[PDB]
Design a protein around this ligand. Structure first.
Ligand SMILES: [Mg+2]
Ligand SMILES: [Mg+2]
Ligand SMILES: [Mg+2]
Ligand SMILES: [Mg+2]
Ligand SMILES: [Mg+2]
Ligand SMILES: [Mg+2]
Ligand SMILES: [Mg+2]
Ligand SMILES: [Mg+2]
Ligand SMILES: [Mg+2]
Lengths: 215, 174, 122, 37
RNA sequence: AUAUGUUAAGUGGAAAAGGAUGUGGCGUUGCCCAGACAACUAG
RNA sequence: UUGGCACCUCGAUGUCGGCUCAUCGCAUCCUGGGGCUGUAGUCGGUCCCAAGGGUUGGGCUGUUCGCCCAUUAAAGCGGUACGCGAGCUGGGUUCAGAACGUCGUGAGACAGUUCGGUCCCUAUCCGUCGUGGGCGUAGGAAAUUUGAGAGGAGCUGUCCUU
RNA sequence: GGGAUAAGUGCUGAAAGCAUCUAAGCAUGAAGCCCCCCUCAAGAUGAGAUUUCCCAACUUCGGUUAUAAGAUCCCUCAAAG
């Protein structure tokens, strides 16, 4: 419900009530003007897609991607707002309301509405065995030349294969992950940020979509 | 079948209007129970609706009594109306009512509950003894089993919900 | 933390002076400990006299481990000595005169005969 | 319920019937319940 | 394909001692409209 | 498991335990559901259906096995070349040294002990874990996506109220 | 939180006038199976879906071309590696 699309900037602590300290991730949630929505009448899933931070004008000589293009020009002219950089589905909520071309708000929530968080990982390059998966290393002394490699992979020749799904050294990777049931300690309106509880994925100046919980 | 040439009756002001393969006994105590019983031929002329098919099949000689006995289960209850009782035993029980939803207090942490159905007149006419009422004998034998399944009879003292008259066993203890 | 085979200058007036922990009893595969748990432990040193004697497996509560404890406001209590109190298996000590200032956290776990029998409690 | 590879009437009040799977015997005392399982 | 039957388990399309109102064509015999074997009321 | 047979391997198919990493049966150890008890309750015996997940730290010996200490909801039984040395140690077993008991007149012997004893290799192809170029998808491109399918997760204690 | 079940418990019911959970129907019933939770996934060649942008001369379409939309080569780095 009301999937805002903020980005992080860091993490600090905020003293709650009587003595309680709770660590807080501060999520900068800039402008979010709703682009076209799609329903069951058109082709079959009721959803609201949302934009995020804008960029400059269109079609001069696009060296970068902070300039738009004739695809995203007419796709964003339809709602008569500036062209965008991050467009995300929300098939969670509310096919009825949310008129097209509406800024959403920042205060859809209250200080106590539980949320979820979807964001990409850090990604730590190509890393090996006992750092990626929870495997334990070998003995570092008494003569053993088996310090840190993964062990055996399969049996002898009554299974002449190695079974796929084997947890071998590959890339650590940034793939998506969703924590569940975080809460909001405080909402700001004027500086246009919110806060959450604990810590969410996705390193600084990243991207994170948040939405209501499913408890 | 030994209930083969043993047609039950058609004694009622009700009318067994056959159509397709079923009937609909539109009667005094209830309105038009209906079920397509089987694929067997029958007669319904004036006083005793009977049934017979081309005999000598041990899959159809047994299939007789599944058709005659159903047309005796239907017309008898819609004439009269019949269901059994449940006399709660021991102490602690106080089976009150909340309309069609009767609750029980058989010593648990919380009261049990139930949602009765149409054509089944739920009745509790005692301080702590209940008695169902309805039209369809198969349909009312369910709920009288479904309230036995709350606290079945504990075989030392005898506490627990029982039917009206039946020999529940008793084992002595210490 | 205090784990499998630590050695603890016990604080009671009941004859033991140093004990060592066999197991940190709790859940299955329990490894670590901190203030308020209960460990089973066998004495090594023994004061002449006292109550208990050397080589007697006794159960004993943990008090004031070396690493801190995070109470829920943001504070920390770091002591400077691992210590212990031998319990009677009714959550009360053996002797009377336990030394060595005690953390407040062992109160929800109904150890309150130790706290009233103690010096300065934080 | 007593699983056993042989069913016989343990006393002469115990009837011998057939059911959904097997050759259950049913009696009036709750120590005689067998099946050919 | 034709004609007679059989099985209702995937038996066919991998096991015996034993257990059993499964189901067919087969034979013998004792109970019988004077009326049993189902069920009611007498001690 | 202990064997029986000698069918493949002597132009070498590396052999016991342990660490690393698993994967599969159910004749089930805990947890879930019932019948039956010579089941007052709490506990307990015995049997049926059930593999989804769990299955501990130390002393002793090379150990397997085993006994013993303290716990835990439980410390299951097995297959996978008695799983796994082109992934690892080498403690024993099966190398030359030496000694003890003993048998042999002798050289020497022993499923009897006892101390010391070199563990080789840079990955072609399948199989894996990641990760890119070409082409297809009846015009070219960008953005957002539905989800046939496939993976992941599934465990429990103690206290208090009734 | 749902749907069908295994063990088991049931209601109605002849075969076999009584009983009888079953033969035809109707229940209920588990950390188990599927949908639900998260992750990947149209190379799913059965190649899906919505919105938005671009449309010409040689010339027997031999398309000769030479461009748009949109990319890229090449550079300064990094939230990536
Ligand atoms: Mg063999
Ligand atoms: Mg030969
Ligand atoms: Mg040769
Ligand atoms: Mg060779
Ligand atoms: Mg070799
Ligand atoms: Mg089993
Ligand atoms: Mg398992
Ligand atoms: Mg030692
Ligand atoms: Mg000699």
């Amino acid at each position: 419900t009301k999937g805002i699309l903020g980005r992080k900037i860091g993490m600090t602590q905020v003293f709650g009530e009587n003595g309680e300290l709770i660590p807080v991730t501060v999520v900068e949630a800039k402008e979010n003007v709703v682009l076209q929505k799609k329903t069951v009448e058109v082709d079959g899933y009721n959803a609201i897609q949302v934009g995020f931070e804008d960029k400059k004008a269109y079609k001069k000589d696009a060296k970068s991607n902070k300039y738009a293009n004739k695809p995203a020009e007419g796709h964003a002219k339809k709602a008569d707002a500036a062209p965008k950089r991050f467009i995300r589905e929300f098939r969670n909520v509310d096919v009825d309301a949310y008129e097209v071309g509406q800024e959403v708000s920042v205060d859809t929530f209250v200080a106590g509405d539980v949320i979820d968080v979807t964001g990409v990982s850090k990604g730590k390059g190509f890393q090996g065995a006992i750092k990626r998966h929870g495997q334990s290393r070998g003995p570092m002394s008494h003569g053993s030349h088996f310090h840190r490699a993964p062990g055996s992979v399969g049996m002898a020749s009554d299974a002449s294969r190695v079974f796929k799904g084997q947890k071998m050294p590959g890339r650590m990777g940034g793939n998506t992950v969703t924590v569940q049931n975080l809460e909001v300690v405080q909402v700001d309106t004027e500086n246009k940020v919110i806060l959450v509880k604990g810590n969410v994925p996705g390193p600084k100046k990243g991207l994170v979509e948040i939405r209501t919980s499913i408890k | 079948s030994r209930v083969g040439k043993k047609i039950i009756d058609i004694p009622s002001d009700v009318t067994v209007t056959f159509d397709g393969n079923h009937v609909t006994v539109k009667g005094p105590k209830g309105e038009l129970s209906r079920t397509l019983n089987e694929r067997m031929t029958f007669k319904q002329e004036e006083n005793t609706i009977e049934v017979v098919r081309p005999s000598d099949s041990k899959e159809d000689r047994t299939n007789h009594g599944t058709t005659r006995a159903l047309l005796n289960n239907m017309v008898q209850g819609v004439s009269q109306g019949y269901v059994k009782v449940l006399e709660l035993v021991g102490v602690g029980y106080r089976a009150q009512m909340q309309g069609k939803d009767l609750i029980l207090n058989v010593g648990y942490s919380h009261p049990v509950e139930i949602k009765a159905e149409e054509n089944i007149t739920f009745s509790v006419e005692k301080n702590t003894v209940v008695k169902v009422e309805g039209i369809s004998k198969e349909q009312v034998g369910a709920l009288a089993s479904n309230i036995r399944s709350v606290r079945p009879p504990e075989p030392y003292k005898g506490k627990g919900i029982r039917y009206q008259g039946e020999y529940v066993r008793r084992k002595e203890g210490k | 933390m205090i784990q499998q085979e630590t050695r603890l200058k016990v604080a009671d007036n009941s004859g033991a002076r140093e004990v060592l922990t066999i197991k940190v009893l709790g859940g299955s595969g329990r490894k670590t400990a901190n203030i308020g748990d209960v460990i089973v432990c066998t004495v090594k040193n023994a004061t002449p006299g006292g109550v208990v004697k050397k080589g007697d497996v006794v159960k004993a509560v943990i008090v004031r481990t070396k690493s801190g404890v995070r109470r829920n406001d943001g504070s920390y209590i770091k002591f400077d000595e691992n210590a212990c109190v031998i319990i009677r298996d009714d959550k009360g000590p053996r002797g009377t005169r336990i030394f060595g200032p005690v953390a407040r956290e062992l109160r929800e776990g109904n150890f309150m005969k130790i706290v009233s029998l103690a010096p300065e409690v934080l | 319920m007593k699983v056993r590879p042989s069913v016989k009437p343990i006393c002469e009040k115990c009837k011998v019937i057939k059911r959904k799977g097997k050759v259950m015997v049913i009696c009036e005392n709750p120590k005689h319940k067998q099946r050919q399982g």
